[PDB]
Amino acid sequence: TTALVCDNGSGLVKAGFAGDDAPRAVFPSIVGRPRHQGDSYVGDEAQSKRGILTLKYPIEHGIITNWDDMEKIWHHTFYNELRVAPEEHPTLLTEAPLNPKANREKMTQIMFETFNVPAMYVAIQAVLSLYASGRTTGIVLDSGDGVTHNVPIYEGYALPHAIMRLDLAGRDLTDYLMKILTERGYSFVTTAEREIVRDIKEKLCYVALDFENEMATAASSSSLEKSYELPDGQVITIGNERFRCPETLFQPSFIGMESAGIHETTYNSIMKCDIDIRKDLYANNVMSGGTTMYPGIADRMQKEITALAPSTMKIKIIAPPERKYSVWIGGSILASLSTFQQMWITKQEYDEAGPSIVH
Ligand SMILES: Nc1ncnc2c1ncn2[C@@H]1O[C@H](COP(=O)(O)OP(=O)(O)O)[C@@H](O)[C@H]1O
Ligand SMILES: [Ca+2]
């Protein structure tokens, strides 16, 4: 039998078969129900029918908060995207770091009681990303759609006391760029327009090695300008917007938040950990999630952590090309191991013991 891997993303579901190199299904973590009851849609079909539906994010901040809609996302995943009978496949689910214990239990209860999977497992997203980089010790920066975490990991296990959470990720950067471009005179307010600005963000944005220098260059030449044709036929040119957008990850004050930036959350996370493991964390900073895809983010992180860390500390930022899917790939690996097969919670163990078995 083939095991399934479902990464329950704040913005995107990544689902597929354990052993595959990439998720076969990548779709928005969105459920749409009729505006007027006289039934649900999920993912791209929900967005297409948005004019007749109310759209909701059941996993908006990395934590599943709407269980009836998460049921719909999982039903869509099994039956519409992967086209499998869930009762025929062990299923690996991902959870956010600091997922409440009752939340993990509800994920377990739905898998067995609603979908009758024969076996399941819940793994921490950041832990899977570390495994996908061939490591069991290191500190992950996972920046997705709705949340960013630092997760220090030692000998295979997250250190929950040192986890840092930043309520700032890719959704917030798209919102910032929407606001910036709207103020420039291009109206970007609707769902369809959010899609356009997201596309501009992913194609043209980058992280400046030195913000102040990059601003001086954009102020004094056209050399950083990039153009993008909108659906209405207008050509928009952006310059400093390209790097002011993701600079928000290092200066959350750009969108009015008092939070530490990702360089300070990474450094604080490491300093919460055993002094004796900090050398290994500094040398093994892995970046995961779509919001770490910006060109220049690894060099910027190298520079910022160097300025914060002891003068002699060896600092390595690992940014794999496949890091949009590294949480999913780490699940594909773990669930493929012979040593993992005894780790599955079976439906039989669930029927004997109930949801508290997941711990
Ligand atoms: N090349 C890219 N550059 C910048 N942001 C990107 C890129 N590719 C994807 N993203 C952003 O990453 C987010 C989705 O990342 P992902 O790790 O799937 O999030 P989640 O797991 O929380 O659903 C979106 O905000 C998307 O716009
Ligand atoms: Ca994620």
UniProtKB/Swiss-Prot annotation:
Enzyme Commission numbers on file: 3.6.4.-
Known catalytic reactions: ATP + H2O = ADP + phosphate + H(+)
Presence of keyword Protease: no
Keyword Flavoprotein annotated: no
Localisation: Cytoplasm, Cytoskeleton
Modified residues (ADP-ribosylarginine): R165
GO biological process: actin filament bundle assembly; actin filament polymerization; mesenchyme migration; positive regulation of gene expression; skeletal muscle fiber development; skeletal muscle thin filament assembly
CDD domains: ASKHA_NBD_actin
Residues with the N6-malonyllysine modification: K49
Highest taxon listed in the record's lineage: Eukaryota
Record GO cellular component, one term: stress fiber
InterPro entries (alphabetical): Actin, Actin/actin-like_CS, Actin_CS, ATPase_NBD
Residue ranges, annotated region (Interaction with alpha-actinin): 98-111, 346-358
Gene3D superfamilies in alphabetical order: 3.30.420.40, Actin, Chain A, domain 4 (3.90.640.10)
Sites of Tele-methylhistidine modification: H61
Family: Belongs to the actin family.
PANTHER family hit by this protein: ACTIN
Note: In vertebrates 3 main groups of actin isoforms, alpha, beta and gamma have been identified. The alpha actins are found in muscle tissues and are a major constituent of the contractile apparatus. The beta and gamma actins coexist in most cell types as components of the cytoskeleton and as mediators of internal cell motility.
Main function: Actins are highly conserved proteins that are involved in various types of cell motility and are ubiquitously expressed in all eukaryotic cells.
Assembly notes: Polymerization of globular actin (G-actin) leads to a structural filament (F-actin) in the form of a two-stranded helix. Each actin can bind to 4 others. Interacts with alpha-actinin. Identified in a complex composed of ACTA1, COBL, GSN and TMSB4X. Interacts with TTID. Interacts (via its C-terminus) with USP25.
Descriptive protein name: Actin, alpha skeletal muscle
Organism this protein belongs to: Oryctolagus cuniculus (Rabbit)
Organism taxonomic ancestry: Eukaryota, Metazoa, Chordata, Craniata, Vertebrata
